[PDB]
Nucleic acid binder design. Structure first.
Ligand SMILES: [Mn+2]
Length: 301
DNA sequence: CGTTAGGTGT
C-alpha cells in the first residue's frame, strides 16, 4: 500500500510534521528515522536522519562545493518524492492499540525491501552527440520517517520514505531524477511491501484475509465495521466527493487527491489519543487477543 | 513540470 506525492517548493509546508508528528509515539524511540539507499551510502549517510542534513539535501545542497540547479520557475522546483507505505488498518489497530512490536519490525523490513526495488528504477538524463538520452543509475537517497497516527487522529502505521530529487550519474554528477519509471511502478512497489509484510505477519502467527478485487490484505479478526470506525479520513474523503456529486469511482485520482487536502484538518496529548483508542475499541466489542497461530492461511502463495 | 491512480488516504 503505497502513495506517491511530489514535494515542490510550493507545497513543502506539508513536511513540517515529519519530526513533530512522532513525539510521544508508542515505538518512536526503538529509531523512527533511517537513511536508506545506495546513494545515501555514497554520501556517507547512515543511521538516524538529522534535520540539518535533511534540509540541506532537500534544497539540493550536496556539499559546500556542489549545489544543484533543478529550476529553469523555482516555485515548481521539485525537492523530492514522498513514498508513503501504509500498513492495513487492521494491522495498525493490532500494533498500536493492543501493542505488538513484532508488527513494527515487519513494516520496517517491508519498507526497506520496497526501497531496494525502487532503486532499480532510478533514471537520469545525459547528453550524447548533442541529443538527450536516459540512463539507469541504480541509486537513490532516501530518508524514512515512521508515524503512527492519521490526520484524523486514528491509528495508522505508515512510513514517509522521502526520496530526494537527486541521483548520481555514471560520470559522478548528481542530477534530478527522471521520475517517470517510479510513478508507473507505484502498484508494483506497493506489492513488494505488501508481500513482505504478509510473509512476516504470517511468520508471527496472524490470520490474514485477502481481497482479490483490490489486491490487499488485513487482519481477519476485525469486522468490516470495526475497521471502518478507525478510518475517519477515508470517510471524510467519501463525504467530500459526495458533496461534489461524485463517488470514489466516478472521481479521478487528480480530484480525489485534492479532496484529501481540502478535507484535511489542522492540540491533544498523546495520552488522550491512546486512551480514546482503547475505549472506542471496547465500545465496538473488539477482542485483540487473536495472535494464536490459527486460520486457513488465505494469503499464503 | 506532464506522467501513476488499492482507500486505509499519505
Ligand atoms: Mn505521517
Amino acid at each position: 500500500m503505497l502513495d506517491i506525492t511530489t514535494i515542490t517548493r510550493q507545497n513543502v509546508t506539508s513536511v513540517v510534521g515529519y519530526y513533530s508528528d512522532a513525539k510521544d509515539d508508542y515505538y518512536s524511540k526503538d529509531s523512527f528515522t533511517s537513511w536508506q539507499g545506495t546513494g545515501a551510502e555514497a554520501l556517507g549517510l547512515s543511521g538516524d536522519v538529522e534535520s540539518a542534513r535533511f534540509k540541506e539535501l532537500l534544497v539540493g545542497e550536496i556539499d559546500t562545493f556542489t549545489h544543484m540547479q533543478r529550476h529553469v520557475d523555482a516555485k515548481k522546483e521539485r525537492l523530492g518524492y514522498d513514498l508513503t507505505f501504509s500498513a492495513p488498518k487492521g494491522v495498525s489497530m493490532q500494533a498500536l492499540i493492543h501493542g505488538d512490536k513484532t508488527i513494527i519490525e515487519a513494516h520496517e523490513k517491508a519498507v526497506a525491501a520496497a526501497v531496494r526495488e525502487a532503486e532499480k528504477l532510478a533514471q537520469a538524463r545525459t547528453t550524447r552527440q548533442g541529443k538527450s538520452v536516459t540512463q539507469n543509475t541504480n541509486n537513490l537517497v532516501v530518508a524514512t520517517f515512521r508515524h503512527e497516527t492519521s490526520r484524523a487522529l486514528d491509528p495508522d502505521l505508515h512510513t514517509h520514505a522521502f526520496v530526494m530529487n537527486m541521483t548520481q550519474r555514471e560520470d559522478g554528477q548528481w542530477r534530478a531524477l527522471k521520475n517517470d519509471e517510479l510513478m508507473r511502478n507505484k502498484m508494483h512497489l506497493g506489492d513488494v511491501y505488501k508481500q513482505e509484510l504478509a510473509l512476516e505477519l504470517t511468520k508471527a502467527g496472524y490470520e490474514l484475509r485477502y481481497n482479490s478485487k483490490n489486491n490487499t490484505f488485513d487482519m481477519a479478526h476485525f469486522s468490516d465495521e470495526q475497521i471502518r470506525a478507525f478510518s475517519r479520513r477515508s470517510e471524510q474523503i467519501e463525504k467530500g466527493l459526495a458533496a461534489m456529486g461524485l463517488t470514489r469511482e466516478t472521481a479521478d485520482a487528480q480530484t480525489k487527491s485534492r479532496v484529501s487536502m481540502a478535507t484535511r484538518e489542522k492540540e491533544h496529548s498523546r495520552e488522550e489519543i491512546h486512551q480514546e483508542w482503547a475505549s472506542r475499541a471496547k465500545t465496538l466489542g473488539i477482542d485483540f487477543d487473536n495472535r494464536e497461530w490459527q486460520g486457513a492461511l488465505e494469503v499464503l502463495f
